[PDB]
Design an enzyme around this catalytic site. Structure first.
Site, PDB file in Angstrom:
ATOM      1  N   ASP A 213       0.821  -1.209   0.000  1.00 12.55           N
ATOM      2  CA  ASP A 213       0.000   0.000   0.000  1.00 12.55           C
ATOM      3  C   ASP A 213       0.860   1.266   0.000  1.00 12.55           C
ATOM      4  OD1 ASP A 213      -2.385  -1.412   0.049  1.00 12.55           O
ATOM      5  OD2 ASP A 213      -2.844  -0.938   2.145  1.00 12.55           O
ATOM      6  N   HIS A 267      -0.030  -7.899  -0.386  1.00 11.44           N
ATOM      7  CA  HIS A 267      -1.339  -8.532  -0.351  1.00 11.44           C
ATOM      8  C   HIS A 267      -2.006  -8.405  -1.713  1.00 11.44           C
ATOM      9  CE1 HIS A 267      -1.729  -4.350   0.920  1.00 11.44           C
ATOM     10  NE2 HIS A 267      -2.955  -4.379   0.427  1.00 11.44           N
TER      11      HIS A 267
HETATM   12 FE   LIG Z   1      -3.865  -2.686  -0.593  1.00 11.41          FE
END
Ligand SMILES: [Fe+3]
Ligand SMILES: CC(C)[C@@H](NC(=O)[C@H](CS)NC(=O)CCC[C@H](N)C(=O)O)C(=O)O
Length: 328
Positions: A213, A267
């Protein structure tokens, strides 16, 4: 495929003044951050039923004309100033996901970063109030509700790393935060467009490929449909769904400033043919925010990593994520 250990952490002490109880929360945050990298925050005080209901009403009632009117520059050449905020269209038969992204409600034409046209700052675009009554009020309120929860979580991360509780939170301010909310719809489709399904190296069908992220931390609500997997050395593990908690993980800015002590977990999103919502809040600092990197493993904490300004991090990271994983 095995299941990830994702603990449920009662974060309510982080809103209080029992300092020892805060340290016990911080220990659990530390433990999860050095394990799979994910935990659920429970007892958070946010009305997630209302959030999911109001988001569903919006996604289900917006028309094609309104989507073009709200579209980011990738979908509408007229909207050159909308790179982040606005509507991200689905493409029937080709791309299933759609979303609506909004930024700091304090970013107005009066705001100095808007006056200066600083990259990554934009004024939000909203649907017509008469077609979507109460939506803008709800969404702006929600931004500050989740800002508040995120501020508490940042106190927990600071204590977990041995710092004073405002070490991160002092850079997370309502006047300049680059944090965003994304209201994502993943639809049920029959038949499901094959162009919208990616095949992973390991054969798993995916809606969104592996990534770290672009955030300090990510604070995510999702409906109760299992979809996320986290990478470990022994392969991908399923993260169980829980539609009453927030799923928390670190982004690559945390990994930078801790010399990878808290990694940004890799992820991905499995393909599931089910109507569902994914509502992330990306905790970003201000454009000029700089935190000196440090290494919690070293007695002196000294790190040789360069301080990185948050604005330059975010500009580079958002573009890189589009290039690697596709226009969303
Ligand atoms: Fe993500
Ligand atoms: C969640 N995935 C996502 O939201 C993916 C990977 S975390 N993230 C993004 O596309 C970045 C959105 C950034 C946002 N437009 C902004 O300018 O701040 C999912 O459920 O796909």
């Amino acid at each position: 495929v095995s299941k990830a250990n994702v603990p449920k952490i009662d974060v309510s002490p982080l809103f209080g003044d029992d300092q020892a109880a805060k340290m016990r929360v911080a220990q659990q945050i530390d433990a999860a951050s050095r394990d799979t990298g994910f935990f659920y925050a429970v007892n958070h005080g946010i009305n997630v039923q209302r959030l999911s209901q109001k988001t569903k009403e919006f996604h289900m009632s917006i028309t094609p004309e309104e989507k073009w009117d709200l579209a980011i520059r990738a979908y509408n050449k007229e909207h050159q100033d909308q790179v982040r905020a606005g509507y991200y269209l689905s493409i029937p038969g080709k791309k299933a996901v759609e979303s609506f992204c909004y930024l700091n409600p304090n970013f107005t034409p009066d705001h100095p970063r808007i006056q200066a046209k600083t990259p990554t700052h934009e004024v939000n675009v909203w649907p017509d109030e008469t077609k979507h009554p109460g939506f803008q009020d709800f969404a702006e309120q929600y931004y500050w509700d989740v800002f508040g929860l995120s501020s508490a979580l940042l106190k927990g991360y600071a204590l977990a790393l041995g710092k004073e509780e405002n070490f991160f939170a002092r850079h997370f301010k309502p006047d300049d935060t680059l944090a965003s909310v994304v209201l994502i719809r993943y639809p049920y489709l029959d038949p499901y467009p094959e162009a919208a399904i990616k095949t992973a190296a390991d054969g798993t069908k995916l809606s969104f490929e592996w990534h770290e992220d672009v955030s300090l931390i990510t604070v995510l609500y999702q409906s109760n449909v299992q979809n996320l997997q986290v990478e470990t050395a022994a392969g991908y593990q399923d993260i169980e769904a829980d539609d009453t908690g927030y799923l928390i993980n670190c982004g690559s800015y945390m990994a930078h400033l801790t010399n990878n002590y808290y990694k940004a977990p890799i992820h991905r999103v499995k393909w599931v043919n089910a109507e569902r919502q994914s509502l992330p809040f990306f905790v970003n600092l201000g454009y000029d925010s700089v935190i000196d990197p440090f290494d919690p493993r070293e007695p002196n904490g000294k790190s040789d990593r360069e301080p990185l300004s948050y604005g330059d991090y975010l500009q580079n990271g958002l573009v890189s994520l589009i290039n690697k994983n596709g226009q969303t």
